[PDB]
Amino acid sequence: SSLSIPRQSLYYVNKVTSVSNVQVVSPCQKQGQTYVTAFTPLTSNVQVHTSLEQLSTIRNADVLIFNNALSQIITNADLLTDFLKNATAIGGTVIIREDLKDCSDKRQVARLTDYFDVFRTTDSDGNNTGLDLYTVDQVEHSNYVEQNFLDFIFVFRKKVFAPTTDATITFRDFLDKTQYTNTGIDAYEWMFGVNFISPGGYDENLKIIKRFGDFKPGQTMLDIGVGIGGGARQVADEFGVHVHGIDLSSNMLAIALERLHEEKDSRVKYSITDALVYQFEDNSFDYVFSRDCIQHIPDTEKLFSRIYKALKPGGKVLITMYGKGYGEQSDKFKTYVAQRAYFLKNLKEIADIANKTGFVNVQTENMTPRFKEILLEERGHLEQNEAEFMSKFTQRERDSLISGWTDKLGYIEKDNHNWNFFLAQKPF
Amino acid sequence: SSLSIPRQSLYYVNKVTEGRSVSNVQVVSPCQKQGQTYVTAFTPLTSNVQVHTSLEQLSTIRNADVLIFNNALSQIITNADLLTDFLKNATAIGGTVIIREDLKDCSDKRQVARLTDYFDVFRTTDSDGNNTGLDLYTVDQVEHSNYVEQNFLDFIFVFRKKVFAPTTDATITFRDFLDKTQYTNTGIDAYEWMFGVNFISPGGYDENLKIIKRFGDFKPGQTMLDIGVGIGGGARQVADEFGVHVHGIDLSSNMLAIALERLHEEKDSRVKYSITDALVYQFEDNSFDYVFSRDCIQHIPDTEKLFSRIYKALKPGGKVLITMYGKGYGEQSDKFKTYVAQRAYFLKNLKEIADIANKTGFVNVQTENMTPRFKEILLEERGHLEQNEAEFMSKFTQRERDSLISGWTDKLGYIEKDNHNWNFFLAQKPF
Numbered sequence: 001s002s003l004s005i006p007r008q009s010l011y012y013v014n015k016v017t018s019v020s021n022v023q024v025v026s027p028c029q030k031q032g033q034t035y036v037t038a039f040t041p042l043t044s045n046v047q048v049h050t051s052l053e054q055l056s057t058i059r060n061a062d063v064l065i066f067n068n069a070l071s072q073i074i075t076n077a078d079l080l081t082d083f084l085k086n087a088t089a090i091g092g093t094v095i096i097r098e099d100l101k102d103c104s105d106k107r108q109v110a111r112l113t114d115y116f117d118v119f120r121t122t123d124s125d126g127n128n129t130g131l132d133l134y135t136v137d138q139v140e141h142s143n144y145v146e147q148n149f150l151d152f153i154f155v156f157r158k159k160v161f162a163p164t165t166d167a168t169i170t171f172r173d174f175l176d177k178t179q180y181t182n183t184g185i186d187a188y189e190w191m192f193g194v195n196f197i198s199p200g201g202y203d204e205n206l207k208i209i210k211r212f213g214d215f216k217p218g219q220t221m222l223d224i225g226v227g228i229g230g231g232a233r234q235v236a237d238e239f240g241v242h243v244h245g246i247d248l249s250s251n252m253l254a255i256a257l258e259r260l261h262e263e264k265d266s267r268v269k270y271s272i273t274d275a276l277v278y279q280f281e282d283n284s285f286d287y288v289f290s291r292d293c294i295q296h297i298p299d300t301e302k303l304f305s306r307i308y309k310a311l312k313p314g315g316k317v318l319i320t321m322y323g324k325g326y327g328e329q330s331d332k333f334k335t336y337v338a339q340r341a342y343f344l345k346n347l348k349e350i351a352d353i354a355n356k357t358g359f360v361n362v363q364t365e366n367m368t369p370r371f372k373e374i375l376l377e378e379r380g381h382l383e384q385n386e387a388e389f390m391s392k393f394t395q396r397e398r399d400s401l402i403s404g405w406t407d408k409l410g411y412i413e414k415d416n417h418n419w420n421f422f423l424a425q426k427p428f
Numbered sequence: 429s430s431l432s433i434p435r436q437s438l439y440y441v442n443k444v445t446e447g448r449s450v451s452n453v454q455v456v457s458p459c460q461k462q463g464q465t466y467v468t469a470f471t472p473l474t475s476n477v478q479v480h481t482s483l484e485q486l487s488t489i490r491n492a493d494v495l496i497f498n499n500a501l502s503q504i505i506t507n508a509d510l511l512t513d514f515l516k517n518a519t520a521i522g523g524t525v526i527i528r529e530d531l532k533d534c535s536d537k538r539q540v541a542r543l544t545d546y547f548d549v550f551r552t553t554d555s556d557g558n559n560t561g562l563d564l565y566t567v568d569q570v571e572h573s574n575y576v577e578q579n580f581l582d583f584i585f586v587f588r589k590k591v592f593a594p595t596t597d598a599t600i601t602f603r604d605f606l607d608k609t610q611y612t613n614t615g616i617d618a619y620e621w622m623f624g625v626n627f628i629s630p631g632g633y634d635e636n637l638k639i640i641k642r643f644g645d646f647k648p649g650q651t652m653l654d655i656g657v658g659i660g661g662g663a664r665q666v667a668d669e670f671g672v673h674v675h676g677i678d679l680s681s682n683m684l685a686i687a688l689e690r691l692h693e694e695k696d697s698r699v700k701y702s703i704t705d706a707l708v709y710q711f712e713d714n715s716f717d718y719v720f721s722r723d724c725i726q727h728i729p730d731t732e733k734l735f736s737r738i739y740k741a742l743k744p745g746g747k748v749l750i751t752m753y754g755k756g757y758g759e760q761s762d763k764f765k766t767y768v769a770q771r772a773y774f775l776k777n778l779k780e781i782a783d784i785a786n787k788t789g790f791v792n793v794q795t796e797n798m799t800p801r802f803k804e805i806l807l808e809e810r811g812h813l814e815q816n817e818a819e820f821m822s823k824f825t826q827r828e829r830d831s832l833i834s835g836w837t838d839k840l841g842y843i844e845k846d847n848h849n850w851n852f853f854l855a856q857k858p859f
């Protein structure tokens with residue numbers, strides 16, 4: 001009904017793409033027709049179809065849009081795979097709007113993201129093809145009007161994928177299958193504190209964010225690597241700041257989304273997306289925040305460039321991260337770094353990248369002493385609540401938290417692992 | 429409970445005290461736990477913050493630089509004597525006076541207008557024998573309520589106590605002049621019938637949609653300030669059509685109480701409203717993608733100050749679009765002068781608007797004389813009334829029907845003499 005809905009899809013199509021035709025599959029005919037109306041600036045060559053059935057008829061759709069067209073097949077792998085084969089063969093840019101509020105699995109978005117992200121098939125050339133994720137965003141009308149936070153727009157470009165060598169076939173898959181499995185996330189959340197996957201939980205995050213200075217209601221913040229959402233939720237609730245959180249782990253964000261849908265707050269919105277892929281509007285954010293994420297991101301220069309452009313002039317960036325100290329690296333620490341796929345920088349390198357990007361008023365701080373305190377407290381909290389922890393988790397999970405925390409304390413003593421703080425400003 | 433609530437009051441206190449010192453804050457909050465959140469929130473300004481749980485304890489307070497009421501009037505709103513007693517105490521004691529009051533459960537779904545009027549016109553004598561009262565900064569919505577509960581009727585009234593010069597004028601503020609003269613509730617209803625549902629401007633929904641498309645391509649989540657938002661049709665249209673977040677302001681509490689009632693019914697947190705003067709509210713610099721004003725600024729005398737404030741509030745590269753009643757270049761008729769004076773319009777011609785825009789620093793300045801379209805619309809609207817008189821007479825009085833027919837005929841006459849024009853202005857803040 002509301003034209004804002006299909007116009008949101010047009011906005012993403014513009015981001016990822018000229019276009020000679022748009023094919024829309026929408027069981028709801030009235031809604032389908034709003035896409036014809038909305039897409040005129042791009043092209044008037046927009047046709048609506050009532051059914052997936054009619055999908056195999058279609059060919060050569062520069063843009064292919066599904067509007068609540070999958071509700072009957074979501075829980076069926078076989079039918080989903082059939083859909084994916086057709087969609088990939090037929091579409092250039094593929095948009096899937098699907099309302100998941102009524103799914104029995106309140107984290108269905110992660111299952112769908114995974115299925116769509118890893119699907120591969122051979123085209124007529126015997127080439128390896130699939131869908132390349134741009135983002136999974138929330139329908140803004142739904143967030144702001146109905147307070148339905150589980151209505152999604154999946155945005156993909158069909159492409160030929162170069163051959164891969166690992167057991168996981170995308171970085172998204174690597175995150176969700178390795179460090180940020182659902183069990184992994186649950187264990188971490190117990191260790192760090194409710195809603196957090198970062199040192200010291202709520203109270204530590206609040207201390208850190210207050211370093212931005214004086215917040216004003218309605219200012220905007222981008223949170224890079226927002227995890228299960230505790231930081232985003234905290235800044236909205238404490239300061240009335242509107243947070244756009246992004247994360248490439250669908251397992252992490254599916255939990256954040258579930259919790260937002262339960263405890264509604266339209267100051268917060270989330271995107272399943274890579275920080276180096278999503279295209280933010282220039283000069284749009286008052287703040288960019290990243291809490292213990294960017295050790296995961298190799299191309300720090302590109303990241304810092306994208307942050308600089310997205311900030312308003314005078315806007316501030318605050319990043320905390322795992323980094324490296326200046327001690328000679330132990331073989332044990334190198335093994336950890338490789339298994340986590342961390343790309344660690346020291347504070348001199350961070351300062352240099354910030355200078356080269358254009359940031360001013362740079363402040364860096366080595367918070368490793370505080371990290372040591374927190375690690376000791378967290379390990380102690382687990383070691384003194386074994387009964388409770390053992391009632392929710394396995395011995396294997398208890399052991400990996402105790403030993404991993406002990407490992408990190410060791411890495412600190414060798415000055416291998418540091419906890420680094422970076423705060424800077426886009427010039428006025 | 430949520431600290432964002434008392435922090436919103438701190439934000440306004442900072443605006444209205446914006447140089448001066450604050451030595452103490454007195455909070456009256458029947459809910460003790462919420463009251464305590466004001467102590468926590470106000471520390472950056474002062475730690476000298478005390479919480480009281482009753483208006484009963486109000487008379488005992490003295491010299492409160494900032495005086496805050498948190499849902500303290502809920503039980504007494506319907507008794508004007510109790511409200512008057514409250515106002516006498518608050519005005520005597522307080523410097524900056526903040527009233528947070530949730531009106532969602534009021535039987536009067538436009539209670540905000542009744543309270544704004546009462547608070548705005550209240551006068552009493554201070555110890556020096558001066559005439560005193562409360563000077564409106566704004567009536568804003570509690571943002572936590574808009575975004576979390578979708579309660580759009582939870583308000584923060586912000587005032588400064590001051591001495592007012594004596595006056596015997598029938599309306600003692602401009603806010604009162606709007607609400608008692610052109611924009612009475614009956615006046616608003618008649619205009620809405622004439623212009624179209626949700627609009628108090630030429631041509632209703634379809635004309636507004638044509639005009640806003642002149643901004644170019646909107647992107648979802650961009651922000652717009654709407655100056656003189658009226659009963660809200662334009663703001664609601666922009667949000668629904670384009671996903672743009674609109675902050676609408678209007679000095680008529682009658683107009684905005686309708687907009688607010690309608691937003692509360694048909695919830696949309698992309699829209700928020702403030703009862704405030706466009707020349708008083710302090711917007712953050714460099715914050716808006718767009719500033720829009722639809723057939724409002726003929727009411728505002730100080731166009732230079734207005735344009736300066738718009739310029740500062742826009743982001744670099746942001747756009748301003750204003751339609752307005754203006755004057756043409758014909759010799760003014762006596763009838764037109766009488767109309768202009770009774771309406772208290774301050775009309776500029778298009779050359780004057782362009783000159784002020786350029787002097788302010790705007791770039792890509794465009795102006796257009798839309799008087800021929802205005803003539804078309806006036807004829808259509810008058811025709812619609814004249815061809816549907818039975819419908820109109822079943823809903824309104826003969827006097828109201830005559831008022832619209834003769835008023836529209838008058839404006840068509842003013843156009844033919846080139847007295848009244850309909851002027852368009854579009855410009856950009858430079859990068």
Ligand SMILES: Nc1ncnc2c1ncn2[C@@H]1O[C@H](CSCC[C@H](N)C(=O)O)[C@@H](O)[C@H]1O
Binds near residue numbers: 226294
């Ligand atoms: N390139 C990338 N883009 C977006 N998110 C990323 C990313 N690389 C890693 N992340 C995310 O960074 C997060 C680090 S865990 C910290 C989560 C959160 N900031 C908190 O304080 O609790 C993970 O959820 C991970 O999936």
Ligand SMILES: Nc1ncnc2c1ncn2[C@@H]1O[C@H](CSCC[C@H](N)C(=O)O)[C@@H](O)[C@H]1O
Binds near residue numbers: 659680683724
């Ligand atoms: N100084 C001022 N500040 C804010 N609003 C003002 C004002 N002077 C006049 N107004 C408001 O300007 C409005 C003009 S009527 C037009 C309303 C709306 N823009 C629409 O298109 O329907 C009135 O509601 C009036 O109260």
